[PDB]
Write a protein that binds this ligand. Structure first.
Ligand SMILES: C=C1C[C@H](C)C[C@@H]2CC=C[C@@H](C/C=C\C(=O)O[C@H]([C@@H](O)/C=C/[C@@H]3CC(C)=CCO3)C[C@@H]3O[C@H]3[C@@H](O)C1)O2
Ligand SMILES: C/C(=C\c1csc(C)n1)[C@@H]1C[C@@H]2O[C@@H]2CCC[C@H](C)[C@H](O)[C@@H](C)C(=O)C(C)(C)[C@@H](O)CC(=O)O1
Ligand SMILES: Nc1nc2c(ncn2[C@@H]2O[C@H](COP(=O)(O)OP(=O)(O)OP(=O)(O)O)[C@@H](O)[C@H]2O)c(=O)[nH]1
Ligand SMILES: Nc1ncnc2c1ncn2[C@@H]1O[C@H](COP(=O)(O)OP(=O)(O)CP(=O)(O)O)[C@@H](O)[C@H]1O
Ligand SMILES: Nc1nc2c(ncn2[C@@H]2O[C@H](COP(=O)(O)OP(=O)(O)O)[C@@H](O)[C@H]2O)c(=O)[nH]1
Ligand SMILES: [Ca+2]
Ligand SMILES: [Ca+2]
Ligand SMILES: [Mg+2]
Ligand SMILES: [Mg+2]
Ligand SMILES: [Mg+2]
Ligand SMILES: [Mg+2]
Lengths: 351, 428, 52, 437
């Protein structure tokens, strides 16, 4: 009888995982501060990794990778891409980004201005977007074509921000003339196998894309939280502004004569592999006294030439309501039971 | 050589004490003559903990025998090992104590107590470095109960910095001599709470049930009950008697076992216990020792451990087996039932292994637990106490020796306070 | 990478490689004595209580 | 030549001390009677080995060592052991009754009675020294003598010998081999009281040594004897620079200079390779690159932690056997591309390297196979704070209910010392964090 504890009550995914583990009739939940556990579904912040792997007679497993935050925080991700030889400044799937510390606090202000001026003089599209990790849902974002308003927005705040070239020519779903972003769920187990969940979700805008107004952030921001509030067309084309893969694929076939696998997924798999392989030496628990796994949420943008772009990586992602059952069961099957066995058509794609 | 001085008092104390010396003498290769005959040097390494070497070349138990009448002790002298004890260490009166705590504590006992202390002092002076004392007695009668606690009080005054340890037999109506046993036990428990470091609670109720249920003995005797006690006593004192890393002396055991000074009342357990007769020939697997040892059925305090939580546990395994297997099984028990071990005392279960097994067995396990479920014992006794005390029944036996009602009221308050203290830490 | 301060002898070699750039006696005595006094006082209380 | 005096306190300290001196004798060709044939300067010398052994006109080579324990059974083993002739009675100090796993008993109650005698015996050895360098103190964290008496000794050594350096080898508490529930109390009490007085301390977690013994020596359930022979190798590789001709870590002051910029953060992490079972029929012989790489595998560390998630303040490589600098430099470059190694901004990314040509000596009939080359890495990394965090947390659980506290107060310690000591550790945990960021 395997034991486990729960230290994140606000986790949508793992509560389902918890419920599932009990139903096995071979997993027993313990009080959250009891250290004789096989499995830890730990807290998001300041998880005591240092206290794992020192309980004799217990193989211990946690649901986070110590170090994975380098990929999952905005500033760190940019830094990681610029300074890693295998990703490099010349990386073709990540938007030109710059790290900007507010003046009331190294920094890349003058490097950003240097490229911004090159674009202005060269008649090239010069819209940028500012954001950070402190962006509580829909707020903390400014889209502009003027560097003055961008840098001034960042100074008014107190935390580190990033400036990222805003892709001005997204792929637009018809009917609607509307923006979208793709969410992929990736599970990395204790052996560092990288499993991509079969199902993704397109989180779509319900308002036609309008390049003449970067002020009204409803047709520009795909965040579900924003759509369910400020958009008056929320749910017109698809339920909850969520298009799944069967439909999106059918659409690409009908409208563009291409498949989801060929035009987009290949690039997604390539990016997921590149990111995770890069930090593998930093975070692998292959010879550690405890073992990690983690579920990530990769966010992608597609442009009008069918090129995929990495937006951000999430370390504690939720699922889409209709997909919770399947994915959570998968986490159990491949992440947990692999280490702790209970007594064909995988839902994952092994990258 | 860290010496322990042994005292047995009253009928129950002397009978159980005599059996203990029989069992451990055999284990150490000492015959009724006091002359050694053993194959292994391990036997003689820490013999001086319990035995004196008075002359070439016999070993004499550092044991003092105490009673207010001569019968049981006379019988001890007749017994197989009677000649082994030092004749001067027999200290007896003639009156008896009439199953009366007050007679043992205040009247008859007071007359004889200095005589006992003279012998105790005589033994103690001859100690290169004295650890402390262990007392065997019941709480149900008068001599072991009333005079026993009196001795402990006097001993503490004379040696305030030694460890005081006792094996105390609690009464139960299932094995009962008289109705005043709850009065005597309640008065005694209060003395123990104040003045002992370690008390092993041997419940006659548990001993009986283990005989009735597990051993399939329809009519158990005191002899059957005492065989359980001598087996357990041999097991709990293994660490003191043989070379070892853990709980190797009284103070170290107390430091590991006792997180709060008043809560020092332990439930012992033994394994294996097997009904005759077919099954006895097969040796037991290490997993089997472990599982029986933590079994409530194997507990000798008649409390259900599942009703409370363990503060501390000490286990002992003898003899020839795998430490690797011993560690694995021990870790299994805690890992599978971790709710039953307080989380605020990390790693509260310590395990020892000794090579030499008990006589008649290939291997065995002794359990000593500081559980909060021990409160069930004191509760049971508190109930029986107040049932009579409400109506002041049988009190005249006590008031007649000079005690008054207040002392009874105080004793009952203190034991109810003791029960409350246990409840506190079961909830924490 | 740079090597420096190389020192050789019959027994062996050593070098550097750079990749990039109180209580007084009286106080102690006082503390030990203070602990001893506290021990004495607890025992006196014990014997006092025992005398009762 | 400057002398070093070794002091071994408590069971762990004395038993480990015994293992090291056995090894020191094998390494230097000193016989159990203490005669060293190869030493042509009879009756005296100022060779490098003399820093650890003095000499008698009779030709005997005598460890500059003091063994202290509150109970006499462990030191009696020394007195009566294979190497009994080496030591003399004034070197060995025992008591009648021990500290009972109680820091306060070892520090206050029993320590007060025996401290003056210990200093006197140490003084006798120091009087024998032309240029005393300082002390190496071997002890456990968890025992009452090891924690309590050692802390008192350290305070008084700072007083009688203010200029001198003091190094520590401390056994960190581990339940697989642990003898007491209150070791966390004792560890924190001793760490608080000893922080000011120690210049450099090498922690060895019994958990790590235990697992290495199980994993690489294939011992089902290791004893203290298995544990100590492994520990003594690490100690020997650390002290080899003091006992042999060389230019690195030649004196005790060099340890602090090379491994401890920040005085409070004076606990370097030790990693050792390779550990190979003698019972193994044949083993391939690891290269310089392989053993050096193994220095960055957590499984080879004396304390389990993840240096990938901390920062280095200093790194030091001590090789023994067939090693040349070019192989070392090559290996470091390869490791540097693969492994993750971050230094603090205020320190250079670099390694100080020491090489001794004599391969590691092994005890005959031990569990350790002879190998042609080996390395011990000393690195001052913030990751070792993980060990403090574990200790402090266990301390916190028990202390919140005040479990076991009365045993300490009963010896004369005040409750305030507990919180005072825990506060110090909280500060120490912060110091590592600030440096570690
Ligand atoms: C075999 C088991 C259950 C599992 C398989 C054994 C598991 C592994 C090792 C030891 C046992 C615990 C030991 C004895 C035991 O459980 O006995 C029970 C009964 O006495 C209740 C004991 C509990 C156990 C513990 C650990 C704390 C509280 O008391 C009595 C149990 O019916 C006996 C038997 O079924 C026990 O737990
Ligand atoms: C021999 C025993 C167990 C055993 C040995 S091998 C096996 C599979 N079980 C234990 C011995 C333990 O020391 C305790 C002895 C208790 C004696 C009994 C109370 C009683 O006196 C005795 C006559 C018996 O009841 C049995 C003979 C059945 C006794 O062997 C039961 C028992 O488990 O003793
Ligand atoms: N590695 C190793 N650890 C030991 C050894 N002996 C004891 N220990 C560890 O040290 C701690 C026990 O402290 P000891 O050194 O035995 O106790 P002490 O210092 O003699 O103190 P007292 O017994 O209280 O007088 C436990 O954590 C043991 O695991 C040993 O020989 N080798
Ligand atoms: N460079 C860019 N070009 C075009 N659109 C962009 C963009 N960067 C962000 N966006 C849009 O803005 C939205 C903001 O999402 P972003 O990844 O910036 O923050 P976030 O809400 O996803 C934080 P987290 O995923 O950690 O919870 C995205 O959904 C995307 O549609
Ligand atoms: N287990 C056990 N209990 C006993 C024995 N003799 C008496 N008792 C119990 O001890 C209590 C009687 O006290 P006892 O010791 O005989 O009286 P004392 O001589 O005045 O101390 C009752 O609870 C009896 O059940 C014995 O040999 N074994
Ligand atoms: Ca009379
Ligand atoms: Ca010489
Ligand atoms: Mg998002
Ligand atoms: Mg009687
Ligand atoms: Mg009777
Ligand atoms: Mg000791």
């Amino acid at each position: 009888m395997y034991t486990f504890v729960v230290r994140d009550e606000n986790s949508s995914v793992y509560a389902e995982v918890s419920r599932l583990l009990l139903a096995t009739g071979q997993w027993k939940r313990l009080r959250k501060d009891n250290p004789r556990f096989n499995l830890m579904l730990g807290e998001r912040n300041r998880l005591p990794f240092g206290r794992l792997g020192h309980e004799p007679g217990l193989v211990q497993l946690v649901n986070y990778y110590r170090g994975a935050d380098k990929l999952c925080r905005k500033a760190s991700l940019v830094k990681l891409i610029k300074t890693s030889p295998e990703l490099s400044e010349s990386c073709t799937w990540f938007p030109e980004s710059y790290v900007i510390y507010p003046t009331n606090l190294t920094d890349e202000r003058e490097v950003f201005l240097a490229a911004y001026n090159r674009r202005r003089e060269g008649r090239e599209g010069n819209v940028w977007i500012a954001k950070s990790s402190a962006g509580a849902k829909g707020e903390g974002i400014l889209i502009s074509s003027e560097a003055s308003e961008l840098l001034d927005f960042i100074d008014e705040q107190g935390q580190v921000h990033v400036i990222q070239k805003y892709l001005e020519k997204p792929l637009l779903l018809e009917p609607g003339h509307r923006k979208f972003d793709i969410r992929s769920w990736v599970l990395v187990d204790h052996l560092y196998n990288i499993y991509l969940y079969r199902e993704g979700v397109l989180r779509t805008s319900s308002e036609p894309y309008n390049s003449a107004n970067f002020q009204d952030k409803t047709c520009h921001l795909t965040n579900h939280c924003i759509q369910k509030e400020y958009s008056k067309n929320y749910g017109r084309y698809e339920e909850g502004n969520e298009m799944f893969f069967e439909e999106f694929n059918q659409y690409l076939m009908d409208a563009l004569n291409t498949t989801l696998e060929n035009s987009i997924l290949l690039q997604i798999k390539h990016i997921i592999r590149s990111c995770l392989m890069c930090i593998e030496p930093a975070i692998s628990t292959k010879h550690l006294h405890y073992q990690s796994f983690q579920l990530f949420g990769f966010d992608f943008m597609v442009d009008e030439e069918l090129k995929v772009w990495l937006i951000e990586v999430n370390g504690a992602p939720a699922c889409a309501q209709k997909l919770y059952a399947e994915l959570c069961q998968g986490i159990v099957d491949v992440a947990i039971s692999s280490v702790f066995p209970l007594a064909p058509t995988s839902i994952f794609i092994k990258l | 050589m860290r010496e322990i001085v042994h005292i047995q008092a009253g009928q129950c104390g002397n009978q159980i004490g005599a059996k203990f010396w029989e069992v451990i003498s055999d284990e150490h290769g000492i015959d009724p003559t006091g002359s050694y005959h053993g194959d292994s040097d391990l036997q003689l390494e820490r013999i001086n903990v319990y035995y004196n070497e008075a002359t070439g070349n016999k070993y004499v138990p550092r044991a003092i025998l105490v009673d207010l009448e001569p019968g049981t002790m006379d019988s001890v002298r007749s017994g197989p090992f009677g000649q082994i004890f030092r004749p001067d260490n027999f200290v007896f009166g003639q009156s008896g104590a009439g199953n009366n705590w007050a007679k043992g504590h205040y009247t008859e006992g007071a007359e004889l107590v200095d005589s006992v202390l003279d012998v105790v002092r005589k033994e103690s002076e001859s100690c290169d470095c004295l650890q402390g004392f262990q007392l065997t007695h019941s709480l149900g009668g008068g001599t072991g109960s009333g005079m026993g606690t009196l001795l402990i009080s006097k001993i503490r005054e004379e040696y305030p910095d030694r460890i005081m340890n006792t094996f105390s037999v609690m009464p139960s109506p299932k094995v009962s001599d008289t109705v005043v046993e709850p009065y005597n036990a309640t008065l005694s428990v209060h003395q123990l709470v104040e003045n002992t470091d370690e008390t092993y609670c041997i419940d006659n109720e548990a001993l009986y049930d283990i005989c009735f249920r597990t051993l399939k003995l329809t009519t158990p005797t005191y002899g059957d009950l005492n065989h359980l006690v001598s087996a357990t006593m041999s097991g709990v004192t293994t660490c003191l008697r043989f070379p070892g890393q853990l709980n190797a002396d009284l103070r170290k055991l107390a430091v590991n076992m006792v997180p709060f000074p008043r809560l020092h009342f332990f439930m012992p357990g033994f394994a294996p216990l097997t009904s005759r007769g077919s099954q006895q020939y097969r040796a037991l697997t290490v997993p089997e020792l472990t599982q029986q040892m933590f079994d409530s059925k194997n507990m000798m305090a008649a409390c259900d451990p599942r009703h409370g939580r363990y503060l501390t546990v000490a286990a002992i395994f003898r003899g020839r087996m795998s430490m690797k297997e011993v560690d694995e099984q021990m870790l299994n028990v805690q890992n599978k039932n971790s709710s039953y071990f307080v989380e605020w005392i990390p790693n509260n279960v310590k395990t020892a292994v000794c090579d030499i097994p008990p006589r008649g067995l290939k291997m065995s396990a002794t359990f000593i637990g500081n559980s909060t479920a021990i409160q069930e014992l004191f509760k049971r006794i508190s109930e029986q106490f107040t049932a009579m005390f409400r109506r002041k029944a049988f009190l005249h036996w006590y008031t007649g020796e000079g005690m008054d009602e207040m002392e009874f009221t105080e004793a009952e308050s203190n034991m109810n306070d003791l029960v409350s203290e246990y409840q506190q830490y079961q909830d924490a | 990478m740079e090597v420096i301060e190389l020192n050789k002898c019959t027994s062996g070699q050593s070098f550097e490689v750079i990749l990039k750039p109180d209580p007084s006696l009286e106080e102690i005595q006082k503390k030990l004595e203070a602990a001893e006094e506290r021990r004495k006082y607890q025992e006196a209380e014990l014997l006092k209580h025992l005398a009762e | 030549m400057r002398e070093c005096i070794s002091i071994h306190v408590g069971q762990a300290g004395v038993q480990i001390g015994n293992a090291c001196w056995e090894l020191y004798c094998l390494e230097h060709g000193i016989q159990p009677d203490g005669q060293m044939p190869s030493d042509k300067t009879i009756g005296g010398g100022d060779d490098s080995f003399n820093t650890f052994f003095s000499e008698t006109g009779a030709g005997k080579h005598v460890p500059r060592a003091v063994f202290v324990d509150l109970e006499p059974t462990v030191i009696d083993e020394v007195r009566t052991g294979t190497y009994r002739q080496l030591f003399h009675p004034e070197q060995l100090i025992t008591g009648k009754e021990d500290a009972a796993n109680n820091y306060a008993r070892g520090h206050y109650t029993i320590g007060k009675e025996i401290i003056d005698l210990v200093l006197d015996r140490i003084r006798k050895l120091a009087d024998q020294c032309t240029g005393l360098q300082g002390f190496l103190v071997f002890h456990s964290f968890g025992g009452g003598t090891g924690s309590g008496f050692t802390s008192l000794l350290m305070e008084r050594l700072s007083v009688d010998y203010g200029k001198k350096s003091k190094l520590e080898f401390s056994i960190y508490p581990a339940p697989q081999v642990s003898t007491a529930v209150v070791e966390p109390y004792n560890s924190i009490l001793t760490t608080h009281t000893t922080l000011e007085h120690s210049d450099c301390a090498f922690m060895v977690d019994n958990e790590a040594i235990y697992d290495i013994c199980r994993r690489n020596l294939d011992i089902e359930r290791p004893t203290y004897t298995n544990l100590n022979r492994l520990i003594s190798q690490i100690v020997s590789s650390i002290t080899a620079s003091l006992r042999f001709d060389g230019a690195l870590n030649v004196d005790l002051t060099e340890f602090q200079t090379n491994l401890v910029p920040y005085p409070r953060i004076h606990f370097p992490l030790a990693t050792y390779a390779p550990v190979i079972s003698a019972e193994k029929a044949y083993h391939e012989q690891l290269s310089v690159a392989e053993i050096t790489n193994a220095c960055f595998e957590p499984a080879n560390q004396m304390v389990k932690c993840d240096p990938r998630h901390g920062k280095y303040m200093a790194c030091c490589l001590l090789y023994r056997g067939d090693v040349v600098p070019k192989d070392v430099n090559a290996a470091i470059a390869t490791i540097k591309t693969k492994r993750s190694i971050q230094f603090v901004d205020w320190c250079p990314t670099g390694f100080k390297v020491g090489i001794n040509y004599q391969p590691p000596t092994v005890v005959p009939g031990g569990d350790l196979a002879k190998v042609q080359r080996a390395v011990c890495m000393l690195s001052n990394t913030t990751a070792i704070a993980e060990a403090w965090a574990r200790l402090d947390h266990k301390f916190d659980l028990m202390y919140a209910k005040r479990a076991f506290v009365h045993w300490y107060v009963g010896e004369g310690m005040e409750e305030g010392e507990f919180s005072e000591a825990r506060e110090d550790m909280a500060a120490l945990e912060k110091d590592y964090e600030e440096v570690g960021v």
